[PDB]
Amino acid sequence: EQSLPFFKLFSFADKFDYLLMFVGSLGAIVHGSSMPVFFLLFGQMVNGFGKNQMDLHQMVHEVSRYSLYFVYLGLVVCFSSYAEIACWMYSGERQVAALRKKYLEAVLKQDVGFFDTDARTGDIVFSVSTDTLLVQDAISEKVGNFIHYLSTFLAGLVVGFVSAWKLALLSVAVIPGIAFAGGLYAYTLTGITSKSRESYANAGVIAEQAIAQVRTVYSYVGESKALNAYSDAIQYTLKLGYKAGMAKGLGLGCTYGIACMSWALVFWYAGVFIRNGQTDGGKAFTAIFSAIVGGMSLGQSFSNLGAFSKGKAAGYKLMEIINQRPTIIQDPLDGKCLDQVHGNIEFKDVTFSYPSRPDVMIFRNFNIFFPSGKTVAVVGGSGSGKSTVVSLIERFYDPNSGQILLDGVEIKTLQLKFLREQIGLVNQEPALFATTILENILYGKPDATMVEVEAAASAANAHSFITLLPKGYDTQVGERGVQLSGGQKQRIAIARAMLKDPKILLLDEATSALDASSESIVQEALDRVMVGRTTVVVAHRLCTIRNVDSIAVIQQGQVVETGTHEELIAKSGAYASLIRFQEMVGTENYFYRLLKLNSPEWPYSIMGAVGSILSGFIGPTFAIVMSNMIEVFYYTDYDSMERKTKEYVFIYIGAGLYAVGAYLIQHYFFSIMGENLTTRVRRMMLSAILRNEVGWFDEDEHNSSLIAARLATDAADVKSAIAERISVILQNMTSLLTSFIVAFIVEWRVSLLILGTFPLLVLANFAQQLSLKGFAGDTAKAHAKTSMIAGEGVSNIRTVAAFNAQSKILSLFCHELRVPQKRSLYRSQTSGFLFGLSQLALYGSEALILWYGAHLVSKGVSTFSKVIKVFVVLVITANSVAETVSLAPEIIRGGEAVGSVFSVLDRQTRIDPDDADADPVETIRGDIEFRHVDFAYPSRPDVMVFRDFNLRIRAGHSQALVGASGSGKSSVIAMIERFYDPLAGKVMIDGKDIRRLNLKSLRLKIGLVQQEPALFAATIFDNIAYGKDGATESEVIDAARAANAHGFISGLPEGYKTPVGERGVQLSGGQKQRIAIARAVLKNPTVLLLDEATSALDAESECVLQEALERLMRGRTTVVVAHRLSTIRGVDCIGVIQDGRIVEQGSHSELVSRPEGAYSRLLQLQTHRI
Ligand SMILES: Nc1ncnc2c1ncn2[C@@H]1O[C@H](COP(=O)(O)OP(=O)(O)O)[C@@H](O)[C@H]1O
Ligand SMILES: Nc1ncnc2c1ncn2[C@@H]1O[C@H](COP(=O)(O)OP(=O)(O)O)[C@@H](O)[C@H]1O
Ligand code: VO4
């Protein structure tokens, strides 16, 4: 797959960032290059066997001075390490923030066309969360460490050039093997990272889709299906990670083996050179040490190379989206700002085909007139051309032919910000963001004070219900207003449209939930403030548009007639056809628990720990062999030094092969155990989340995008923390223990002193680990909040485009992201200071060791040879282990991630889905009853939506539940399919409490349809076959025929295979509701918890659907709710009043014959509207 070049990642750095990166590079270079020249100086005393050992008095003074020089080097390294760590971390944090802001701005600028063809909310959330973290890790202090290692290697090579050239020619000719291995490693890791990212992106979308529509998932029991799909979506990542781990082990082993063969050859040539006499001791010592340190540094920098590979792999995907230029805008040509705006929309021979289905022609030579100040109404069939006109007007899609005129010029030539402001669009189904009511209203005009908002709310008949809420204007509505009533949602959208005060009003299929009285109030408000402005009304019910001057019906291709009410009746046209159709229808200690959780694959962990320890041995063995080599060199051994050198080069060859084997084994087995653990924890976390009740979802921090981001982020660190920390910790402790034992072997008093210094280093590391942890937790929540904001913005692009609100989203993003920069500055400064202090403490320890050894030499025993061998071994081992401190921060940032993982698993649901023993009874009766049920929603537990009321539905009957003011129409449905718990009383379905019956059987025996159906992002056939899984295509076809859906479905090109899209877009409300009814009838439950169904079906299909529903409910119990008072002819148990309490139900015919009542007044008002 394609990958962005590494240098292209630095595309968001200003002058200040360039200076910081330059300072960091200089500091890293100095830190790397300090050591080789320092040991070049150190060689003068390393030659002590022939330099000044004759006079014992001068040895102690000389080595004390050299200890002071080593302390000076410690100060120099401490100062240098501070600069390169702090400057690089600050530069990385600044760049990623600008990248995130630019990416959000670029993705929020794309039109609706880009989102429907290849874009998903889950994909966007995952790209925001994970990829930006990888890019931040790519350009962080990892580059500093890589530059430090490279500078050390080059400095060692230059030092080798100075003393004796041939040795350094070998050390420079061995480069191509390491280069080729690194190239293969980078290429393979980039490929594997691309594949794994693709695999993970699909998994994240599936989980979030199931989480968002939790009510539909619970109603049509499908947690097993979602879990199986999620597990299958991450099947390939196991093999890809296995290959990546095998590649990592092979590269490091090959590098170390090449280094070992180079060391053996360089030792043999150095020996023969000393035999020649051209070289003398110290030069060979310096060259050998330089070569060893260079090979070690390359082996260390291999991991940073891999990190860079992954970073560039993610950076390609991030950069590809932002660089995508938007669709056509082309608006400023002549009419930049016309002051003669009056409406007068002209449509001339305009054709249109949607990008998803370009073959189907929606419009063919479409002509229509929208004169100024005239309330033009649009009516037609269920899905012909109604909402497409609004989409064309609101610059969503251009027409492939023809043009449309805003009374002075084609709309293609305008100003986009100017155009969208003059027209106020009302969505067919409003999409309220997750923000308080007042700010939702302020979406329209952000510069409106309280008085204007109050006036707008009062105009739209929304003051009453808003002021009755506990908080008032600050109550949250949650995701898409799921926790707010359907009727109250429409009032908020109307108020938001009114506050904008546009010159052209586009009333789409709104004003549907308002039963009779709110309808009259909003119509009075509309034709009292919108008089004198261009008006376009798209209404299904014919009574609302009775007082319309010109009713232009829209059918296939073009319009038919543009007459008034009475004029179209005379010819009977096609408008009067709808009228006569309507008339006849009416008649702590959790890390150990996490390791315990990985019990089944214990052999892999054991063998990996064996490999880690075994590679831990080889660290100090190099120093031991080098010390013995220099000892025999200074003896000059002109008897059997040939034998000594050949035996030791054989040792080197064996050690190289040994290291290859050990590294391969260790890395492969840790890779496999880490991937198994990550997959298992992901599966269990998703199962635990799906186990929770709906109330846990109805909160502020429990959002679909938030949960998806948390799942995507946490497990990843859970891998990276477990895989990396375990390897380095075991290796470093094993190497340190081996070096300490070796120090014990040659000396005892000196080594006790060095083991007396470990508390200082461990306390410094503990301080490091403590300091960074506290502020790391705060930033995680902020990043999750930003991801949630981005996902919420992307999910409602239709509302964002209509009401220009990109500035608000950017402002919220910046406000959320402001704090982490300020915290990161101090975090970087503290980390750099602590790293410098740790390095200074580490170096100061060795100087004291050398001084103590010198003092012992002055006193007698433990002479020159023993102390300096200890010094060299400690130097090598400390240099080898001086990587855990650098690796500590990025590992320790996942500590709070693990705590979040266990917090989700720990929580026990209040609603146990099965309980595994709770009366598995399948013989359902259907005689539901309520007894003194008192309920209050957990979100606002101060409203008491239900009073002491009781209602009974005998099996074989039906409910009407007229709900004029939203009190309990949809709340009773939540009781039967229990989502919450009644505070008092009890509810029974089969004569027994449903709290003790297992939910799986009950939810299998019962089925419902939502008031606002939300189709899954799949084909029509998959959506229909969601209920009663394992259904042949014949059954699906029969269900679609019975639901009056085979008509339009067969009209579609790809039969029952056309993709729908997220939330159920790229279709019509009528078609979506038909598909939902088809799924519900396919499930075929004993009790059909029906609800408001004749919402978007007010067309020529109304008679067919109602008859089919009546036939379906012949042997079923239904609770259908309907404020339309037209499709409730089933005269059983209407249930007139549900305002908190209940009122005597009787029957529909009874209350028709009974005197004035809530149903009677509703019918009177509807007939008056008629
Ligand atoms: N975003 C879209 N992508 C592809 N096809 C669409 C899209 N929106 C609407 N359509 C198609 O256009 C037709 C009419 O849709 P719509 O305007 O919603 O009808 P109505 O508004 O009368 O219900 C539908 O059959 C649907 O298949
Ligand atoms: N999930 C929820 N969280 C908080 N309040 C809710 C929730 N669902 C409904 N309500 C409140 O209960 C009242 C009645 O809602 P609802 O049952 O939808 O009425 P209807 O079904 O008659 O439209 C509303 O005013 C709403 O504020
Ligand atoms: O907002 V409702 O149509 O459930 O009364």
Ligand code: VO4
């Ligand atoms: O816009 V609709 O004709 O699916 O109510």
Ligand SMILES: [Mg+2]
């Ligand atoms: Mg529509």
Ligand SMILES: [Mg+2]
């Ligand atoms: Mg409702």
